[PDB]
């Protein structure tokens, strides 16, 4: 009967909640009182990339931290040169309803996707001298929300039908599919060791997945609304989330609970993006109020403001060596700060 | 400098091509085709001549139309409806064979923050079977509040008034029309509505608004 299974599930939930509450002896807020603050931080825009003309949606840095990539509703996928503002490629897309971008770690490929339910992979090192479509990965039902390269042969995708998949670019077939979510997955982030990843959905829950076996190991349920952004801590043991509740939270993998909340009374707009710095001391969040905020990871206090855009800050990223931060927006301009 | 002059030349050529494409791509007019299931969304585009989005196009009197049907995929509408702002108008259509879900959808669309100043064209479809049903069955089974006679004209007027009563912002306008499977008339209605809208936009852009 359903009653016995419901009672068993309730007992299991109560047991795990009791264990989680028992595992918490103190809080990090009362441990961090012995370290000094970072002071006031004021960055200035050193570059401005003005080639697009409609609502940049995604961007991604290269491994060498000099090249970029950007997608817009204009239907163009363009890769930039950050140091000299030069344009080195401009790929014309088949459909203009795109929402994702990805740069291969080896620098040979670029991926894209959107409302057409298909992930397209492009080859940048052809002998003929032009970029051409390599594969068209089909099989998902809902729209694509995120994509990430593991190597030059396998990719992971998150869609709007509550499932994630692991593909094989060599043959175009889905090796493994990850199910267990209720709403639709919005974001995705890969571990530095490339052995595990996490995802956040619209049912206010983020969970940890293993790429080898399609099992779900843990579930985090501390938020109040849909999760919009996900990123790993540089160490590989923690991660932070952003939601339409206008708050951010920091979670721990080996303690399986929440550590900090990054919120203030004056901010009532949802988060669109999140990222860490190189050493993990600072946390950058792109807000809906036309500006970005810099917050201490260990004290939950604001350290600076990166205003200077005229519309939503849709995307945000930090280079590998950590010498710059790029900020896309709906005004069709990319800013490089330092 | 060094041979980076060729790189600068390549960048300039890319920029010129981008500007030309952007200039050439702005002459078209975009329209969003929303409605309930089995309402006749396919019929209007078939007369005017699949998993994700489908985009048909046609030209009529030196003007190019591009119609988008984004109702084929089932997901959270709050996560992809903000992509279709800055569209010229909505082409919401309703069938008279039912039904309150259509009223709910109209109420949701007409008051969205992204679509606060977008004109809406309303089509009332399949009037003949509506007349047959009203001759066979009363309208009170669908609208208990209705008190008028069971004839065609007042019933259609009552349905149109009920649909139009959901508008709250007075800035926008709703163009009602009962096509009843009329040939080559819906295109003319859309053309006149588009002409009015573009004239208003041109007048507002100069500062006379």
């Amino acid at each position, epitope marked *: 009967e359903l009653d016995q299974l419901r009672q068993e599930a309730e007992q299991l939930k109560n047991q795990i909640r009791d264990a989680r509450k028992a595992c918490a002896d103190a809080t990090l807020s009362q441990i961090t009182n012995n370290i000094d603050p970072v002071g006031r931080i004021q960055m200035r825009t050193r570059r401005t990339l003005r080639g697009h003309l409609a609502k940049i949606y995604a961007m991604h840095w290269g491994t060498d931290s000099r*090249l970029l990539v950007s997608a817009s509703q204009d239907g163009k996928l363009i890769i930039w040169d950050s140091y000299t503002t*030069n344009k*080195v490629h401009a790929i014309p897309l088949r459909s203009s309803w795109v929402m994702t971008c990805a740069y291969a770690p080896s620098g040979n490929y670029v991926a894209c996707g959107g409302l057409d339910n298909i992930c397209s992979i492009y080859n940048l090192k052809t002998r003929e*001298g*032009n970029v051409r479509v390599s594969r068209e990965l089909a099989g998902h039902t809902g729209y694509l929300s995120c994509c990430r390269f593991l190597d030059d042969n396998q990719i992971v995708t998150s869609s709007g039908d509550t499932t994630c998949a692991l593909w094989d670019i060599e043959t175009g077939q889905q090796t493994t599919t990850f199910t267990g979510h209720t709403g639709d997955v919005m974001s995705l982030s890969l571990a530095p060791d490339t052995r595990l990843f996490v995802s956040g959905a619209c049912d206010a829950s983020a969970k940890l997945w293993d790429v080898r076996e399609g099992m779900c190991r843990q579930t985090f349920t501390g938020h109040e609304s849909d999760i919009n952004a996900i990123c790993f801590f540089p160490n590989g043991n923690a991660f932070a989330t952003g939601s339409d509740d206008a708050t951010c939270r920091l979670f721990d993998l080996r303690a399986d609970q929440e550590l900090m909340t990054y919120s203030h009374d004056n901010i009532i707009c949802g988060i669109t993006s999140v990222s860490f710095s190189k050493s993990g001391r600072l946390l950058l969040a792109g807000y809906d109020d036309f500006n970005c905020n810099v917050w201490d990871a260990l004290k939950a206090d604001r350290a600076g403001v990166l205003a200077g855009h005229d519309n939503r800050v849709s995307c945000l990223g930090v280079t590998d060596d950590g010498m710059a931060v790029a900020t896309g927006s709906w005004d069709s301009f990319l800013k490089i700060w330092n | 400098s*060094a*041979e980076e002059r*060729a790189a600068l*030349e390549r960048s300039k*050529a890319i920029e010129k091509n981008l500007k030309e494409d952007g200039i050439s791509a702005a002459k078209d007019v975009k329209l969003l085709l929303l409605g309930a299931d089995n309402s006749g969304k396919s019929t209007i585009v078939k007369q005017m001549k699949t998993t994700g989005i489908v985009e048909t196009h046609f030209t009529f009197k030196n003007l190019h139309f591009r119609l988008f049907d984004v109702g084929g995929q089932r997901s959270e509408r709050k996560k992809w409806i903000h992509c279709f702002e800055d569209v010229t108008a909505i082409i919401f259509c309703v069938d008279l064979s039912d039904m309150h879900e259509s009223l709910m959808l109209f109420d949701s669309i007409c008051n969205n923050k992204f679509f606060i100043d977008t004109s809406i064209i309303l089509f009332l479809n399949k009037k003949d079977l509506f007349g047959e049903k009203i001759k066979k069955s009363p309208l009170t089974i669908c609208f208990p509040e209705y008190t008028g006679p069971n004839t065609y004209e007042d019933a259609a007027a009552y349905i149109q008034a009920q649909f139009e009563s959901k508008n709250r912002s007075p800035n926008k306008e709703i163009y009602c029309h009962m096509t009843c499977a009329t040939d080559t008339n819906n295109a003319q209605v859309i053309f006149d509505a588009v002409t009015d809208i573009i004239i208003a936009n041109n007048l507002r852009g100069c500062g006379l608004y």
Partner: single-chain antibody
Amino acid sequence: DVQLVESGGGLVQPGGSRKLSCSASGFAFSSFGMHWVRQAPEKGLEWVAYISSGSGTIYYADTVKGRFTISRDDPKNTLFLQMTSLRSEDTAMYYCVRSIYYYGSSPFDFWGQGTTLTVSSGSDIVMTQATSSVPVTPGESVSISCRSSKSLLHSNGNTYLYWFLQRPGQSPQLLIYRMSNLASGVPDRFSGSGSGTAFTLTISRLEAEDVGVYYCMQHLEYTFGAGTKLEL
């Protein structure tokens, strides 16, 4: 299958004119540069002309300025060369070359076949190669070196030196660009290094297919070296 086919050779009396054409297929011709390197019958290589992409920048050699001109036709995928007032020093073989310039590109990657033009009887950077012939045996390792008059290092950090290999009865090939980067196809047995104005090339585990003449070229501003030959 990238193809560069040339035609227009023959015998021309002194003082006349003759046109040569390059017909290309298999790649996007409109996105590439074009050069016209030529080789004397029993000497090294020499640079002649250059036509950009979009036909917006043309350079000519000092000894052939005014007498010759270059043009391209993107629709038909062809490149021309019009030469007037031929002298006795204009007899050589002419090569059609390919090049693309952006961040990370490798110019001078594909070379043509060649046309023979014979005529009847009637301030600069100098690069020198200290050796002209080096004895070698299979399984051994050798070292090539050439020096320049001035430093090839720019303020941006890139040094512009190129290495080429020509075999018996064959068109030359690209091995190293910018003194450190290996071409797409060359085996790992070849590696190059150098600093300032002294440049070296080393090859390990020599086979029977490595025999030929090696040229070193600079690309800092708008020449080839004399070239050394390995002997079996």
